Amino acid sequence: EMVRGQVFDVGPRYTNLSYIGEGAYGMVCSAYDNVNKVRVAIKKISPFEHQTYCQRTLREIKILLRFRHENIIGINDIIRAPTIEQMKDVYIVQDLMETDLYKLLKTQHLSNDHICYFLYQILRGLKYIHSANVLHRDLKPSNLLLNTTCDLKICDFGLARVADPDHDHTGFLTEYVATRWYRAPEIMLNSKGYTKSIDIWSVGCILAEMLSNRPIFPGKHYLDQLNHILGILGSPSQEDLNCIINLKARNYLLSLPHKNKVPWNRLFPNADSKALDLLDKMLTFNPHKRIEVEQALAHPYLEQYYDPSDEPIAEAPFDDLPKEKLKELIFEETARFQPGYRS
Ligand SMILES: c1ccc(CNc2ncnc3[nH]cnc23)cc1
Numbered sequence: 001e002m003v004r005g006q007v008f009d010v011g012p013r014y015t016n017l018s019y020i021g022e023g024a025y026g027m028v029c030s031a032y033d034n035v036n037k038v039r040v041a042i043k044k045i046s047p048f049e050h051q052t053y054c055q056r057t058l059r060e061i062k063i064l065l066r067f068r069h070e071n072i073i074g075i076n077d078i079i080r081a082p083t084i085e086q087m088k089d090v091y092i093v094q095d096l097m098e099t100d101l102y103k104l105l106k107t108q109h110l111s112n113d114h115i116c117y118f119l120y121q122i123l124r125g126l127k128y129i130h131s132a133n134v135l136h137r138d139l140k141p142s143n144l145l146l147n148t149t150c151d152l153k154i155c156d157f158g159l160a161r162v163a164d165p166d167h168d169h170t171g172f173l174t175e176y177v178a179t180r181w182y183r184a185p186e187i188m189l190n191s192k193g194y195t196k197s198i199d200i201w202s203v204g205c206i207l208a209e210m211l212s213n214r215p216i217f218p219g220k221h222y223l224d225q226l227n228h229i230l231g232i233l234g235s236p237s238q239e240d241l242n243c244i245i246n247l248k249a250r251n252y253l254l255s256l257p258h259k260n261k262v263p264w265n266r267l268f269p270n271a272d273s274k275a276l277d278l279l280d281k282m283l284t285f286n287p288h289k290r291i292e293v294e295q296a297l298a299h300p301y302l303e304q305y306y307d308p309s310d311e312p313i314a315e316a317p318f319d320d321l322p323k324e325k326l327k328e329l330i331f332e333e334t335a336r337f338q339p340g341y342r343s
Contacts, residue, residue, distance in 0.1 A: 056158030071125030204282030
């Protein structure tokens with residue numbers, strides 16, 4: 001139990017603590033699990049002051065407790081106080097992961113084989129997620145935890161939602177949007193953060209980042225984000241212009257000079273041509289003409305790994321409450337890891 005950076009108190013089961021880092025309203029350490037005799041990761045979370053922090057916490061916990069897949073991080077144990085009034089911190093215990101794709105891309109240029117098998121694992125996990133009618137909504141390199149070239153896990157389901165192509169509100173900045181660089185164009189143009197297509201676009205961006213060691217659409221803001229995308233894909237066609245469900249949005253693009261489509265091979269000269277064909281289909285502007293997860297796995301680029309017999313799906317398809325009500329729901333969701341739990 002260290003006190004240098006916010007009291008941990010995860011003992012006596014979890015000892016020999018060591019600081020890793022800190023992200024998203026809390027802190028992260030690795031500890032020794034005296035029950036499983038192996039080092040695990042523990043994230044300390046203190047979200048109860050801010051209602052949005054309570055959203056993501058409850059959101060991620062409900063989903064991860066239901067999900068079970070090699071390519072998706074899980075929750076091993078949750079530590080919290082016996083009473084709601086005493087609970088000010090939550091401790092989520094997960095498998096220790098050596099690094100993530102973000103850190104890896106900073107130090108190494110990936111070979112084609114490791115890019116190929118990384119891509120498979122992402123889509124493998126994503127296939128499960130989408131089969132449960134769930135969208136991750138924030139897929140990016142830092143959310144891809146890594147041990148080896150063969151051990152990739154998807155994490156951070158804080159922004160995850162149940163798929164819902166129907167409901168729409170056009171609430172642009174009223175909803176906590178995804179990481180800009182990996183954000184589908186439909187989200188920025190006509191507010192569409194509830195279809196599976198958005199996750200595929202993110203994976204495309206991740207793929208392009210694996211081929212060149214740098215973000216492909218690194219805009220400063222959302223209009224600049226659209227600038228980068230059209231700067232590579234080219235000016236949207238007449239039909240793609242009709243996908244835009246917004247008056248003022250279908251205007252900034254029309255004032256922009258006409259852009260030619262930059263060939264993928266010109267951007268990535270050293271890339272596998274099969275990779276670039278898949279990339280092309282993941283980064284299609286039109287969300288309806290964009291490749292789906294099962295189709296991507298079946299692309300020739302992944303033909304050496306693709307195996308529907310070894311690609312598990314969900315056995316069953318899977319808010320605006322105050323921070324005090326959400327805290328109760330978190331207190332209930334974590335109640336299964338408490339002594340004396342019934343039903
Ligand atoms: C700061 C913020 C985020 C992270 C990434 N989490 C993390 N790191 C290591 N092992 C894990 N298992 C489950 N999650 C993790 C590290 C430092």
